[PDB]
């Protein structure tokens, strides 16, 4: 994304959080207005802040916007349960000649203890290799807030192609779960020293690794 947001921000009721939106000289630095949108899961986005800091009808003043340099920021004082949602900054970029959004920030209003994910990574099965296919399976469970980012590596090199990752969904215990899958040829799987799944939960990145020589 041309505009960069943290994937997750969280606070308890009554706390203040801020969401940064970092751009560049082709958008926020060029003076193109920054706006913010709020999106409750299940619904369409709504305008929350326009021209940096103006609030539409119905948006409370504990929600504030600002701009400095190549960045913008959304502050929410006094978190209320209704603030739990995804938030997007938006501007214009004159190198791409188009309206651009940030990647989005899930704001969780904490209602239970924070919990780090359990991550399990499986290599391709011998049966799948015998069908001339290979899938790595990265399973992520029991985490709260319900927001993660997943990346993959072959040896030490980032791998972007062949990646399919779910959005976090609520479990019975009201913690969250997600999964990510990496599709490879059997030849790639056998040719690298190892492959890793990297799971980032509020700034904490844990990496699980599997190798074709692990038996």
């Amino acid at each position: 994304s041309v505009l960069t947001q943290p994937p997750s921000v969280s606070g308890a009721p009554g706390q203040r959080v801020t969401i940064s939106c970092t751009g560049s000289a082709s958008n926020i630095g060029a003076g193109y207005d920054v706006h913010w949108y709020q999106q409750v899961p299940g619904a369409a986005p709504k305008l929350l802040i326009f021209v940096y800091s103006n609030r539409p009808s119905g948006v409370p003043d504990r929600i504030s916007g600002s701009k400095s340099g190549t960045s913008a920021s959304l502050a929410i004082s006094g978190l209320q349960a209704e603030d739990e949602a995804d938030y997007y900054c938006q501007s214009y970029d004159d190198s791409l000649r188009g309206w651009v959004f940030g990647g989005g920030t899930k704001l969780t209003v904490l209602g239970q203890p924070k919990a780090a994910p359990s991550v399990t990574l499986f290599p391709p099965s011998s049966e799948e290799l015998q069908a001339n296919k290979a899938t790595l399976v990265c399973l992520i469970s029991d985490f709260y807030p319900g927001a993660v980012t997943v990346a993959w590596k072959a040896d030490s090199s980032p791998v972007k192609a062949g990646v399919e990752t779910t959005t976090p969904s609520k479990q019975s215990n009201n913690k969250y779960a997600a999964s990510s899958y990496l599709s490879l040829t059997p030849e790639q799987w056998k040719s690298h020293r190892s492959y890793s799944c990297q799971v980032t939960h509020e700034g904490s990145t844990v990496e699980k690794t599997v190798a074709p020589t692990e038996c």
Binding site: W99, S125, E128
Partner: protein
């Protein structure tokens, strides 16, 4: 009271052309200063602006998708139409139309949004899953448990169900939500957390039932060996 409502097909097949319609009420598309945009949102991903049309017939497009898009206005019906050519399953997304403030005295932002409409790009083919064992290690862990499972790959449509040992094993079972893949097929995994001490002696079988294709699979999951 400006309102916008999207309409169009829920399902489109690959390479086909998608036509979406935005009906605007309470505001005339002929009025100076009135613009409307289309924005898409792939499942679980960020918003992405696609196109804008103004009260002159001025048309603006994402520079990355320009050659696939056309935006048009039907003044008779007060509607803005999006056409997007050569649909692929990677294009599955919710599409929104939004009244866009469009002029220097106001700003350039998405003021009033439609509710959105989901377009899924997929074939007409039902397809059952391939099921593969996710073998557990017998290696020591702090907790004395190991995870084993079954990968349920490349099926369509949802749903699928997974049981373990014909329903006799329910404790420690976690069947994950499915992923909709770039191919337009689904995959999911079901894992069981079991005692490592049992890996040599208990049998574990996952039973997959994909009722839409009438495919049933039993797969024995055996521990890793060397």
């Amino acid at each position: 009271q400006v309102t916008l409502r999207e309409s169009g097909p829920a399902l489109v097949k690959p390479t086909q052309t998608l036509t979406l319609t935005c009906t605007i009420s309470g505001l005339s598309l002929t009025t100076s200063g009135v613009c409307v945009s289309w924005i898409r949102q792939p499942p679980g991903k960020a918003l992405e602006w696609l196109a804008l049309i103004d009260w002159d017939d001025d048309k603006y497009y994402s520079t990355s998708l320009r050659t696939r898009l056309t935006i048009s206005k039907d003044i008779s019906k007060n509607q803005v139409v999006l056409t997007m050519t050569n649909m692929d399953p990677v294009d599955t997304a919710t599409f929104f139309c939004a009244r866009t403030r469009c002029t220097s005295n106001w700003g350039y932002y998405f003021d009033s949004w439609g509710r959105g409409t989901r377009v899924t790009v997929s074939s007409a083919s039902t397809k059952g899953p391939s099921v593969f064992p996710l073998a557990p290690s017998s290696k020591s862990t702090s907790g004395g448990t190991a995870a084993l499972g079954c990968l349920v790959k490349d099926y369509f449509p949802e749903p699928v169900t997974v049981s373990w040992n014909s329903g006799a094993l329910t404790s420690g079972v976690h069947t994950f939500p499915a992923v909709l893949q770039s191919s337009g097929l689904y995959s999911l995994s079901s894992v069981v957390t079991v005692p490592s001490s049992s890996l040599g002696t208990q049998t574990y079988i996952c039973n997959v039932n994909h009722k839409p294709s009438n495919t049933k699979v039993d797969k024995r999951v055996e521990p890793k060996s060397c």
